[PDB]
A paper describes a structure:
Bet v 2 is a plant profilin panallergen, i.e., it is ubiquitously distributed throughout nature and shares a highly conserved amino acid sequence of up to 75% even between distantly-related organisms. Additionally to its ability to bind actin, profilins also interact with poly-l-proline and phosphoinositides. In this study, we present crystal structures of Bet v 2 in the reduced (without disulfide bridge) and the oxidized (with disulfide bridge) states at a resolution of 2.0 and 1.7 Å respectively. The reduced and oxidized structures were determined at a high resolution of 2.0 Å and 1.7 Å, respectively. Both structures share a central six-stranded antiparallel β-sheet with two N- and the C-terminal α-helices flanking the sheet at one side and a third helix flanking the sheet on the opposite side.
While the overall structure was conserved between these two forms, the crystal structures revealed marked differences near the N- and C-terminal segments, which are linked by the disulfide bridge Cys13-Cys117. By contrast, in the reduced form the helix is more relaxed and extends beyond Cys117, which is rotated by approximately 30° between the oxidized and reduced structures. Moreover, the N-terminal segment harboring Cys13 was moved away from the helix for approximately 13 Å and is partially disordered. In fact, Cys13 is visible in the electron density only in one of the two molecules within the asymmetric unit, and Asp14 to Gln21 is disordered in both molecules of the asymmetric unit. The higher degree of disorder in the reduced form, lacking a disulfide bridge, is also reflected in the overall Cα-rmsd of 0.744 Å between the two molecules in the asymmetric unit of the reduced Bet v 2 crystal. To test the secondary structure content, we pursued CD and FTIR spectroscopy. Both methods revealed a slight increase of helical content in the reduced Bet v 2 form as compared to the oxidized form. Importantly, cathepsin S showed a strong preference for the reduced Bet v 2 isoform, which was completely degraded after 10 min. The reduced form of Bet v 2 was found prone to dimerization and higher oligomerization states under non-reducing conditions, whereas the oxidized form of Bet v 2 remained stable as a monomer. This can be explained by the exposed cysteine 13 in the reduced Bet v 2 crystal structure.
Numbering used by the authors: 2 to 13, 22 to 133
The structure:
Amino acid sequence: SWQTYVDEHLMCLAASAIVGHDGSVWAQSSSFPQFKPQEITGIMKDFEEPGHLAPTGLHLGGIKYMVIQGEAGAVIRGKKGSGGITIKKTGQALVFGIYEEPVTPGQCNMVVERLGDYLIDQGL
């Protein structure tokens, strides 16, 4: 099934998703939150303007994260409690990874990187 394909190729407590720059879901794991378009817009702006989201924090699914060091124009990183969020920009899409202990930041960061690696390799 599509969902078993997605769940085993994405990060699946942790969740992950591939979202177009226009905000449409290309694939999301079973527990990935619904999000708001304005949330995607501010994320797209932080990729243009590093530090943009830092004074207000990063919001996804209404959840507030503290912005930390990412990769300018390419990766956003956020922390909350014992978990956090990683967002990688590709040519056409955004890869999201959300994690909570005992999932580690490094586990999430690497699933996101691998997804972006695949998408960019496909020209997306």
